[PDB]
Amino acid sequence: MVTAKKDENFSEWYTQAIVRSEMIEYYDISGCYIMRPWAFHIWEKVQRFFDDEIKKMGVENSYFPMFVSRHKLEKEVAWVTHYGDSPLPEKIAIRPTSETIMYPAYAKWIRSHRDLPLKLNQWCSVVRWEFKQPTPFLRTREFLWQEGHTAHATEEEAWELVLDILELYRRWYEECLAVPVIKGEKSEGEKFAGGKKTTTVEAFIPENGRGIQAATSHLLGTNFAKMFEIEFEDEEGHKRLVHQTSWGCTTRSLGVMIMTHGDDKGLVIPPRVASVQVVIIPILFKDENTGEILGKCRELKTMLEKADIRVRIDDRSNYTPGWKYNHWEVKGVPLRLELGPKDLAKGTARVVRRDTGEAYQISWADLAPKLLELMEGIQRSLFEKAKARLHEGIEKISTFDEVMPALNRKHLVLAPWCEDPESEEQIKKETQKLSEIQAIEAGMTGAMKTLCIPFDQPPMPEGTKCFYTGKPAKRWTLWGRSY
């Protein structure tokens, strides 16, 4: 049983939810966590979704080495310096990302416009060795991801791909994980080092008021092509720099999903990614025809699987139905199906949905289409409720004086901004200081930073001033405390 309340001690709630559901195990190296099958299966599902989608775009998978030489990297990094006891003459780094590993090869492979576009992806893990507090799934020292890297003859084609991938990330979060996200452009201070423009999808954790970057898609432009001499010839033979993109998304997505839909009973997993969509729990009275009940459960499982419903029967005789109900609730199975002698006699089954607890009596003949309908209802309900919480979590403001009250309500702020990079640094420092003072009156950082400049922009009145500098505002920008 989960016993911390999600709305009272969120940190303890999260730990209990992911440990008691058997998703994670701890490890004696800080910032690294074991992903057990209950979590890993969800990763496999979103991996298959994204892989199928980028394959349709002509992206192909590959595998590049986990090590990068010092001079290539330096053209929060873990450095290998010894094999056994023998020092290496040049230290080598574990990849935090693979631009410097892949792009010398790109420079070799690309010669003609006929070689473009080049589109590669790899599924691997990377290491970003930071000393700040790690969080299971959300912010870890090693994490699983995919990184895609493309090169194009024109900036416009590269940008179109940046946005196509960002839309795939929106679908990963909203359509698979039922997590609402906001598409936007990163600030100059927050964009990828060396890139031209970084786009992002941002999510929100209401219980601690924090934004979090859900995935990222970078227009690198010609910057890395200049760095690595990646050029192509047109048909007349003139050499030009390629235009590049890089994009990535990680197991952070699972953590965001967990935090968005979980409740006081534990996990709630959206049906579209749940490894068990329906758990069948037979009633096993000592004084019943148990073989008949179990046989009917097997028949129902076969029937549901013909509709591609993922089913598990928990026929263990050493646990009670009440124990099983709690067990699979903690694990987030979206539907429970109960079958006992009285149901058998009626030709029906009792189905309980995990998100609301509502129960249904459903005839066996109706079971497959009704459960498909119910699972789409659960998926949409999880998304719509999360989207309403996202909406309620964003305050539209006009001046910096409104920031700290809004942050104290654990909200994000949407504010007109002049987009001066110095002003973002100053806002970060000032909000951190004010947060510290408030903490001392009270008995992760308190700084507010930009999350993104949203693609969907409210109207900007003619003389609207920047909320911090008073200079002419340029765009509406989303800010908050952040991971």
Ligand X SMILES: Cc1cc(N2CC[C@@](C#N)(C3CC3)C2=O)cc(NC(=O)Cc2ccccc2)n1
Rounded Cα distance between 17 and 39, Å, is 12
Distance in Å, CB of 423 to ligand X, minimum:
23
Distance in Å, CB of 121 to ligand X, minimum:
13
Piece in contact with its own copies (CB under 8 A), picked from 67-75, 148-156, 419-427, 430-438: 67-75
Q: How many chain residues interact with its own copies (CB under 8 A)?
A: 50
148 binds ligand X (CB under 6 A): no
CB 395 within 8 A of CB 283: no
Beta strands 243-250 and 142-152, pairing class: antiparallel
Tokens of 254: 């699972």
Rounded Cα distance between 122 and 99, Å, is 12
Distance in Å, CB of 354 to ligand X, minimum:
26
Which are the contacts of 384, defined by CB distance < 8 A and separation ≥ 6? none
Q: 291: helix, coil or strand?
A: helix
CB 5 within 8 A of CB 22: no
Rounded Cα distance between 179 and 329, Å, is 20
Site for its own copies in 247-266 (CB under 8 A): none
Site for ligand X in 154-213 (CB under 6 A): 213
Strands (DSSP E) along 388-428, which ranges? 394-396, 412-417
Which are the contacts of 182, defined by CB distance < 8 A and separation ≥ 6? 201, 202, 203, 390, 451, 452, 454, 456, 478
Considering only the C-alpha atoms of the chain, give the largest distance between any 2 of them, rounded to a whole number of Å: 87
Tokens of 95: 């990849």
468 binds ligand X (CB under 6 A): no
Cα-Cα end-to-end distance for the chain: 28
Q: Which does 285 bind (CB under 5 to 8 A by kind): its own copies, ligand X, none?
A: none
141 binds ligand X (CB under 6 A): yes
Piece in contact with its own copies (CB under 8 A), picked from 12-20, 56-64, 381-389, 433-441: 56-64
Could you tell me the CA-to-CA distances from 125 to 44, 63, 94, 289 in Å, in that order?
Answer: 14, 11, 10, 51
Distance in Å, CB of 316 to its own copies, minimum:
8
Piece in contact with ligand X (CB under 6 A), picked from 98-106, 243-251, 268-276, 380-388: 243-251
Out of 121, 150, 246, 250, the residue judged to bind ligand X by CB under 6 A: 250
Binding mask 75-114 for its own copies (x = CB under 8 A): -xxxxxxxxx------xx-x---------xx--xx----x
Q: Which does 250 bind (CB under 5 to 8 A by kind): its own copies, ligand X, none?
A: ligand X
Piece in contact with its own copies (CB under 8 A), picked from 24-32, 200-208, 280-288, 378-386: 24-32
**Residue type, position 43, single letter:** W
Q: How many chain residues interact with ligand X (CB under 6 A)?
A: 18
Q: Which does 63 bind (CB under 5 to 8 A by kind): ligand X, its own copies, none?
A: its own copies
What is the DSSP-derived secondary structure letter of residue 171? I
Q: Which does 238 bind (CB under 5 to 8 A by kind): its own copies, ligand X, none?
A: none
**What residues line the site for its own copies (CB under 8 A)?**
25, 27-29, 32-37, 40-41, 43-44, 60-69, 72, 76-84, 91-92, 94, 104-105, 108-109, 114, 120, 124-125, 127, 129, 142, 144, 318
Q: Which residues are near ligand X by CB under 6 A? A: 31, 128, 130, 132, 134, 139-141, 143, 145, 213, 215-216, 248-252
